């Protein structure tokens, strides 16, 4: 996991999508904690999410990339497919489901950006955001814009 995570950190530093942030944290001994990254996803242009910089943590297990990272918005995000805890539910983020070791951190972050304006109402992760989306898309979009202004950098 460390060699792959260091390879992806090196790759991230040389080139990454504009507006995105992905940085390893520090271990209690001072070394870089490659298993825990503080990330940020900008809201996509031309969507109600624009202007916001949505912070999230990527937690990697010892066997990454055989296992997906756990992705969690901090603080919790209002989105039909983000659990109340902040954990992002994306099928590629489940080992037994669509995770593949060829998937990279850059692809995950780009995919979570896509998820922001493309929620899946068939299987929602939180009652709050989904209920608003289901009853009133005008109120749903206003709640999204208000949250984008709340998380503006």
């Amino acid at each position: 996991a460390l060699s792959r995570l260091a390879q992806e950190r090196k790759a991230w530093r040389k080139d990454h999508p504009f507006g995105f942030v992905a940085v390893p944290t520090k271990n209690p001994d001072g070394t870089m904690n490659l298993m825990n990254w503080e990330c940020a996803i900008p809201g996509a242009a031309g969507t109600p999410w624009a202007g916001g910089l949505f912070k999230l943590r990527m937690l990697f297990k010892d066997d990454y990339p055989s296992s997906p990272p756990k992705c969690k918005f901090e603080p919790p995000l209002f989105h039909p497919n983000v659990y109340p805890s902040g954990t992002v539910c994306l099928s590629i983020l489940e080992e037994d489901k669509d995770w593949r070791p060829a998937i990279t951190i850059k692809q995950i972050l780009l995919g979570i950006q896509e998820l922001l304006n493309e929620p899946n109402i068939q299987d929602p992760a939180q009652a709050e955001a989904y209920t608003i989306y289901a009853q009133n898309r005008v109120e749903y979009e206003k709640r999204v814009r208000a949250q984008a202004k709340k998380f503006a950098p």
């Binding site: 659990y83 929602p124 992760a125 989904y130």
Partner: peptide, 4 residues
């Protein structure tokens, strides 16, 4: 709604 599904649970984590």
């Amino acid at each position: 709604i599904k649970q984590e």
